[PDB]
Design a protein around this ligand. Sequence first.
Ligand SMILES: *C(=O)[C@H]([C@@H](C)O)[C@H]1C[C@@H](SCC/N=C/N)C(C(=O)O)=N1
Length: 239
Amino acid sequence: GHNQVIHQYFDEKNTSGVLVIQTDKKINLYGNALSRANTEYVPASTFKMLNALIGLENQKTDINEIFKWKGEKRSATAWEKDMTLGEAMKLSAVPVYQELARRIGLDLMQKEVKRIGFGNAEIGQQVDNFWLVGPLKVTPIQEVEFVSQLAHTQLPFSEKVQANVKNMLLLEESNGYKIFGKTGWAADIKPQVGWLTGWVEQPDGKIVAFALNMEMRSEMPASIRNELLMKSLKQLNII
Ligand SMILES: *C(=O)[C@H]([C@@H](C)O)[C@H]1C[C@@H](SCC/N=C/N)C(C(=O)O)=N1
């Protein structure tokens, strides 16, 4: 696991990005734009995690509620179905989480966000878009620390709420490993920012968190972040 082979994976996708890795409060940067690790970006679909936690803890919803699709045209055609808060996490279904956000309410949402101390902790005034176009911005280091506390069940929420949000985030379960995470893509700011923040539950239960953050372009496949990460964690010998 050399910090150079990982520069070339990023050199080669013609992007600019950083991979933050945390292993029990020790943090390392990999990639080819390590200055991104201290830069504030909008969270995007990654804030869904803190939204779910805030919504469940405050009983504005539950893991069994079905969100009804009331007919309107949506940005992706898989989002056009009734679905649970968990299935909306998998699909990054923004309408579901905007409905949750409006139940929470601006006052409650600002209070929770400030208490947790997520990013700049600014949510401004539109309770249903602040993670997508600001004013909320967070750095990739701050992200990997949040997602680290969530894997270790050390966030300021009930034990059962964190477990619930954790179970919404499984991505690949091969070789006795488990990779949890949540993708993101702010395709509406210049330049576009792509996220991938999660952790690896190694077979012995040791927990290694990651926040991949890269500038995006409209032609890249969704699975470019998956591809970059899965092959980076292979290099550092985490899988
Ligand atoms: C979440 O962050 C995305 C956004 C609508 O909030 C949703 C949708 C895709 S992004 C597709 C747009 N650009 C594609 N070239 C997505 C994701 O997988 O990141 N989540």
